[PDB]
Design an enzyme around this catalytic site. Structure first.
Site, PDB file in Angstrom:
ATOM      1  N   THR A   1      44.008   3.531  99.277  1.00 28.70           N
ATOM      2  CA  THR A   1      43.436   2.804  98.142  1.00 28.70           C
ATOM      3  C   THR A   1      43.423   1.046  98.552  1.00 28.70           C
ATOM      4  OG1 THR A   1      44.000   4.107  96.393  1.00 28.70           O
ATOM      5  CG2 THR A   1      43.559   2.118  95.573  1.00 28.70           C
ATOM      6  N   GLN A   2      42.332   0.595  98.297  1.00 26.14           N
ATOM      7  CA  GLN A   2      42.258  -1.000  98.685  1.00 26.14           C
ATOM      8  C   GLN A   2      42.524  -1.851  97.506  1.00 26.14           C
ATOM      9  OE1 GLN A   2      42.503  -2.207 101.623  1.00 26.14           O
ATOM     10  NE2 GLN A   2      42.503  -0.314 102.720  1.00 26.14           N
TER      11      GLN A   2
END
Lengths: 233, 141
Positions: A1-2
């Site tokens: 997840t960014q």
């Protein structure tokens, strides 16, 4: 997840004489939109551990799947999985913490803050914290997000030191948790009035209460607030 | 000719894989294990030969569990049975992770069967030396 999408807010927890208490609202926020109501962020593992997760709901569900798979794999070829070789809170923590630090070091972290709270086999109260950075610490009171700023100051006036833990009762700790939930509903924009509360007591076991609501709110004084300064009507 | 039993996957002039039948003979040398399907589930049972009183009773578990609903008991080479159970647990974990629902009993059966049939396809792998009785309760009973 960014970057997180659907996110849950604060999670509060504290120790008392015979166990621990954790609590968190049931809200999943799509940024500024209170999109999903009734989203349980307290994951009970076994009869002695509860995991409170804040942050990306997708990564929280991934961690739920990981916990279920961990329980299943510990059940394998283990005749004492319901006894001496059951999953302890410290085991679940250490596993989650290793996972979080690895995902950080691979530049693809689980955008979450996790609080593991339970009772060991010898009755000891376990309560520890981890996050997407893999930072781990343990205190008699633990909160995430806005709670870490607002819930802890209220909960630390009950147990400011380890020696205060044997003196706190279940009623005291539960009242403090409910008051902190009310204060968060007062001053947190991404909060909800409906929450869930778990009590891991070394004698009564796991007591899990859902669909709780913040009650006894003071709003009457709002009738006396008129204008932002000089306005009289 | 001769030598049709010296290599796995080699068909004999009759059309048989003699290595598979030798594995079956190895299976017949094991202890007895049974399974009985009742009206709402299944019951597995197995005999454990007590070679000596030095063995700890109630230990040395022989029946293995897959997922939280599948039970497996294998007669024959115990290590091969453990290997097959591990492979089945991996298959069930994959099935659940991909489809959420716990793996149906027939699907698990087909997974184990394809694994064994693959193990009877090459002269570089030895056929399994176990007969496995397994099962459980799924959405279809």
């Amino acid at each position: 997840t960014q970057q997180p999408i659907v996110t849950g807010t604060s999670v509060i927890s504290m120790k008392y004489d015979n166990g621990v208490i954790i609590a968190a609202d049931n809200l999943g926020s799509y940024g500024s939109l209170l999109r999903f109501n009734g989203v349980e962020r307290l994951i009970p593992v076994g009869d002695n551990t509860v995991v409170g997760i804040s942050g990306d709901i997708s990564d929280m569900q991934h961690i739920e799947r990981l916990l279920k798979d961990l329980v299943t794999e510990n059940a394998y070829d283990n005749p004492l999985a319901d006894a001496e070789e059951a999953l302890e809170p410290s085991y679940i923590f250490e596993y989650l913490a290793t996972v979080m630090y690895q995902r950080r070091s691979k530049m693809n972290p689980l955008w979450n803050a996790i609080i593991v709270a339970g009772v060991q086999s010898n009755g000891d109260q376990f309560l520890r914290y981890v996050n997407l950075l893999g930072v781990t610490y343990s205190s008699p009171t633990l909160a995430t997000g806005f709670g870490a700023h607002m819930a802890n100051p209220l909960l630390r006036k009950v147990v400011d030191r380890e020696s205060d833990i044997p003196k706190t009762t279940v009623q005291v700790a539960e009242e403090a948790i409910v008051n902190a939930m009310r204060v968060l509903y007062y001053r947190d924009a991404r909060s909800s009035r409906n929450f869930s509360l778990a009590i891991i007591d070394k004698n009564t076991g796991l007591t899990f209460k859902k669909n709780l609501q913040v009650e006894n709110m003071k709003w009457d004084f709002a009738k006396d607030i008129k204008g932002y300064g000089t306005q009289k009507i | 000719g001769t030598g049709y039993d010296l290599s796995n996957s080699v068909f004999s002039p009759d059309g048989r894989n003699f290595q598979v039948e030798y594995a079956v003979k190895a299976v017949e040398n094991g202890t007895t294990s049974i399974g009985i399907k009742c009206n709402d589930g299944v019951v597995f049972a197995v005999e454990k030969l007590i070679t000596s009183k030095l063995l700890v009773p109630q230990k040395n578990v022989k029946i293995q569990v897959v997922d939280r609903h599948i039970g497996c008991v294998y007669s024959g080479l115990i290590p091969d049975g453990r290997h097959l159970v591990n492979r089945g647990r991996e298959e069930a974990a994959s099935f659940k992770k991909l489809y959420k629902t716990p793996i149906p009993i027939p699907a698990f059966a087909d997974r184990l069967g394809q694994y064994v049939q693959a193990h009877t396809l090459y002269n570089s792998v030895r056929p399994f030396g176990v007969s496995t009785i397994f099962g459980g309760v799924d959405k279809n009973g």
